[PDB]
Structures are given as structure tokens and as C-alpha cells.
Design a protein around this motif. Sequence first.
Motif, short mmCIF file in Angstrom:
data_model
loop_
_atom_site.label_atom_id
_atom_site.label_comp_id
_atom_site.label_asym_id
_atom_site.label_seq_id
_atom_site.Cartn_x
_atom_site.Cartn_y
_atom_site.Cartn_z
N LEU A 131 0.69 -1.40 0.07
CA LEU A 131 -0.02 0.60 -0.03
C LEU A 131 0.40 1.45 0.25
O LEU A 131 0.50 2.22 -0.64
CB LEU A 131 -1.31 0.43 0.83
N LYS A 132 2.19 1.29 0.85
CA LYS A 132 2.44 2.47 1.34
C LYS A 132 3.55 2.63 -0.72
O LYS A 132 3.62 3.80 -1.01
CB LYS A 132 3.59 2.53 1.85
N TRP A 149 0.61 4.33 -2.62
CA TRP A 149 -0.35 5.22 -1.93
C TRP A 149 0.66 6.19 -2.59
O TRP A 149 0.16 7.40 -3.31
CB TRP A 149 -0.32 5.57 -0.45
N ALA A 180 -1.28 7.77 -7.95
CA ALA A 180 -1.73 7.13 -7.24
C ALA A 180 -3.55 7.84 -6.61
O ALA A 180 -5.03 7.43 -6.80
CB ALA A 180 -1.97 7.37 -5.71
N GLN A 217 -7.51 7.24 -4.00
CA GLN A 217 -7.11 6.67 -3.21
C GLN A 217 -8.57 6.74 -2.52
O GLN A 217 -8.33 7.41 -1.16
CB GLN A 217 -6.43 8.37 -2.92
N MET A 250 -8.20 2.61 -3.20
CA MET A 250 -7.10 2.33 -2.04
C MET A 250 -7.52 3.17 -0.81
O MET A 250 -6.79 2.71 0.68
CB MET A 250 -5.86 2.50 -2.23
N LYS A 303 -6.73 1.07 2.31
CA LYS A 303 -5.52 1.71 3.67
C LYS A 303 -6.09 1.61 5.29
O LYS A 303 -6.00 1.60 6.15
CB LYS A 303 -5.87 2.87 3.35
#
Length: 127
Positions: free
Chosen positions: A30-31, A34, A39, A43, A66, A70
Motif C-alpha cells: 500500500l505505501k 499510495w 495513485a 485514493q 485504495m 488503507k
Amino acid sequence: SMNPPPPETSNPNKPKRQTNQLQYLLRVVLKTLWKHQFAWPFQQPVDAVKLNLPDYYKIIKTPMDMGTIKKRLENNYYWNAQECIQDFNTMFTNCYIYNKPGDDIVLMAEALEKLFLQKINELPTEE
Ligand SMILES: Cc1noc(C)c1-c1ccc2c(c1)[C@](O)(c1ccccc1)CC2
Ligand code: NA
């Protein structure tokens, strides 16, 4: 026109865990996606109202994004890595289902998907 409620990100009675694989999905997968230059459309949930896409949620019946992922990871919502991986794949596939090959949004999803695949290739053995 109206957006549906977002996908669930909290449910106290749902079985859930932290695993090392799920930790990798947050800290690495994810990091990495993102922070990517592409991205931003992914988001948060697709806002079909603001984008004037009244057919979006007629076509896409399992939305994912995402922002949702997250929150699920931060909330330790998942039981296993497969559930989270499925969410990313749903996200990408929705974009390909709704849009047409070569659209900017599809190019963006492809770039993110390539990186996703490179990271999940090194998903740790569960320990
Ligand atoms: C993700 C996604 N999947 O299908 C659509 C449409 C989107 C989407 C989500 C957000 C936004 C756009 C498209 C947008 O129309 C767009 C168009 C071209 C390139 C990037 C974003 C503006 C913001
Ligand atoms: Na979606």
C-alpha cells in the motif's frame, strides 16, 4: 444522482487478525502504490456524482479503492492477505471493466498494477 455507501471498513464481530503478510501489505504494498504519481484517482471511492458518471454504480457492483484498503489495513479489518489482495485486484479490474483500453485512467491503473505485482511477488512466508 447518488453514490452508494462506501465499502465496509469497520465490523466488530468480523474475525480479523494481524499477520506478517498483512503488515507487509500495509508497509510495502500500500505505501508503495499510495505515493505513486498516478495513485490519486484511486485514493478514495469513485465519486460518480462529481464525475457525472451516472452509469458507474450500475455497472460496477463491487467497488473498491485504495482509501478503503488503507482503512481496512489500518483497522486490522482483514483475516488474511488473500482478502486484501482480492481488494486490490477488484480495484484494478473495475477500472478495466468500466473504461476503455488506452484511456488515461487505464494507463494509470496499469502502472499501479505492475508495481503491485512486483511487490506481492515478495510477500513473505507467513510467520
Ligand atoms: C478510478 C476510476 N475508475 O473509473 C473512473 C472513471 C475513475 C476515475 C476516478 C477519479 C477520477 C477520474 C476517473 C478522472 O476522471 C480522471 C480522468 C483521467 C485521468 C485521471 C483521472 C478524474 C478523477
Ligand atoms: Na471501483
